[PDB]
């Protein structure tokens, strides 16, 4: 009916488009301001994603506004439904590009955790800045299949917009398959990062327990006076020290060496105990503490903050992914269904609407996840 209709249906509510445009613009501006207040590669990718969403909104909304201003559909206001193609192209173009950006971020997280030494090397900002034009070109080349007799655009509308044709053209199925593959890849990367972060948390908890045992044994040595208790506490401290070095960075070449120095001193103290020197042994323990303050305290602090930031970013990404799923799963499901039925149940429209609200939901969630996010890190 949209293909034959060339006039705006009376009684259609035009406030929805204006509200969505205003909300998207406000969210994009807030996200850009918050990012300008702060760079890491993930933040640059988020900034590029917000900029892409802003460009998509600023290219999509004026067409819908002119459609209401002229009281005519896209086929009527523009000759040979040119806008009905162009708009649709835009409605697909960013819909892929931003999606790809998401994958990139996920891949970054993988390259952040899956390959630590690969990420430790110098990764200049030029790479992140060059990722955006490459993603744009790939998305344009992929969405350039229509208008070349390979794919067609029809009007699945309530009176304002156009989209891809479902039928003999196989571009819609390929686009849905690409979206599903990207979603599966992002989910797999997120689960891998989840498992790696759980392993890191377990290792950090084990190291903290070993450090607490070392401190307790040192306090016992300082408070004890009998040779048997001092020897038992020294044995427990040596066991706890050997149970901590079990977890090839340059700093990792000193930390391990620092433990070797510690254990060695512990052995010395044990020798003193076998010689019957109590006070001397205590002095040795003091030296132990000094070594701890010299070499081990720093590593633990670095491990804590790093992991923290990691988890933060992770949760961010995860939320984003959830959003993307809620926005693209309806569309992929429609693509696989039979066109007849797809119209009979009027499912396609809904999916499209979801896609649209995607441009609203992508930036705002960022402003939702403020730096005071430690509560969520508590889990």
């Amino acid at each position, epitope marked *: 009916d949209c293909e034959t209709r060339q006039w705006l249906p009376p009684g259609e509510s035009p406030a929805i488009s204006s509200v969505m445009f205003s909300a998207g613009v406000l969210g994009n501006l807030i996200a850009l301001a918050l990012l300008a207040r702060r760079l890491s590669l993930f933040h640059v990718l988020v900034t590029e994603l917000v900029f892409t969403d802003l460009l998509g909104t600023c290219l999509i909304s004026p067409v819908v506004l002119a459609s209401y201003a002229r009281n005519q559909t896209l086929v009527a206001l523009a000759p040979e439904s040119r806008a009905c193609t162009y708009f649709a192209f835009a409605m697909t173009f960013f819909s892929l590009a931003t999606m790809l950006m998401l994958f990139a971020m996920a891949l970054e997280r993988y390259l952040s955790i899956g390959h630590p030494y690969f990420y430790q090397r110098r990764v200049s900002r030029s790479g992140g800045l060059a990722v955006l034009p490459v993603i744009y070109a790939v998305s344009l080349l992929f969405c350039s299949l229509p208008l070349l007799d390979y794919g067609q655009y029809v009007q699945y509308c309530p009176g304002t917009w156009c989209f891809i044709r479902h039928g003999r053209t196989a571009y819609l199925q390929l686009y849905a398959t690409l979206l599903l593959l990207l979603i599966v890849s992002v989910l797999a990367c997120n689960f891998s990062v989840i498992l790696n972060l759980i392993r890191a948390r377990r290792q950090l908890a084990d190291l903290e327990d070993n450090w607490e045992t070392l401190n307790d044994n040192l306090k016992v040595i300082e408070k004890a006076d009998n040779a048997a208790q001092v020897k038992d506490a020294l044995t427990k401290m*040596r*066991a706890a020290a*050997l*149970d901590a070095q079990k977890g090839r960075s340059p700093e990792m070449k000193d930390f391990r060496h620092g433990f070797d120095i510690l254990v060695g001193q512990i052995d010395d103290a044990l020798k003193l105990a*076998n010689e019957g020197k109590v006070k001397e042994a205590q002095a040795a323990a003091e030296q132990l503490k000094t070594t701890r303050n010299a070499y081990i305290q720093k590593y633990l602090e670095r491990a804590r903050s790093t992991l923290a930031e990691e988890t933060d970013h992770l949760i961010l990404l995860a939320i984003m992914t959830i959003t993307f799923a809620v926005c693209s799963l309806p569309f992929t499901i429609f693509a696989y269904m039979n066109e007849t039925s797809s119209r009979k149940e009027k499912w396609d429209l809904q999916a499209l609407r979801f896609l649209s609200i995607n441009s609203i939901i992508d930036p705002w969630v960022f402003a939702i996840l403020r730096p005071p996010v430690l509560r969520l890190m508590r889990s």
Partner: antibody
Amino acid sequence: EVQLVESGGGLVQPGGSLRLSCAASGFNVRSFSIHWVRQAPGKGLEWVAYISSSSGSTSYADSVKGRFTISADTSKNTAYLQMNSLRAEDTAVYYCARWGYWPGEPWWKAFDYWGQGTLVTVSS
Amino acid sequence: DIQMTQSPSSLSASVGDRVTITCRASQSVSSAVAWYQQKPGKAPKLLIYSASSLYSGVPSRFSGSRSGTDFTLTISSLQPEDFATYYCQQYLYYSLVTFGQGTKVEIKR
């Protein structure tokens, strides 16, 4: 290759003294601590004495404190264990071994080479 | 005063069978647990050091594992040359060396 030969074992009357010798071949005793293990007939292994020729510290088992004396000679590259005031429980087999010093891998490989060991029998 | 407790004391099996030996320590030891194989009328020989790696020379049929404070020696396939007594030892310190109670595999019939 790395070999440890024990000698000096045999029959000793109760209350006497016996000198056991452990000779190493293939390495220097100043780079590895020398340990002695005792095994009773129909039983398991048991550490009895240890010496570290790098620093000069010695250690013994709680049951043998005050009766055994271990020493090491770097000029001859060997170890000597003197046993005084023996008892009937000292009928066993002694083995000599080397355990590396702490820094690094040699320490982790504990008792990588075991000697042939010698039999000691204390009976009147 | 670590006292190693070895639960398996007598087990009988044939060639090709899997053998599992468990060693428990009275005190928490990180990795200072080793397994030794002593033949009747012969000197013992180190099989597994640090409970993770394998000794240079011993066959790959023996493996070691750790779970909390319990160490596990696993033999995938028995052979007529692997029928000897097994001992668990702790080497946390030079003066702290305590052996287990022993474990001698037998031929079942």
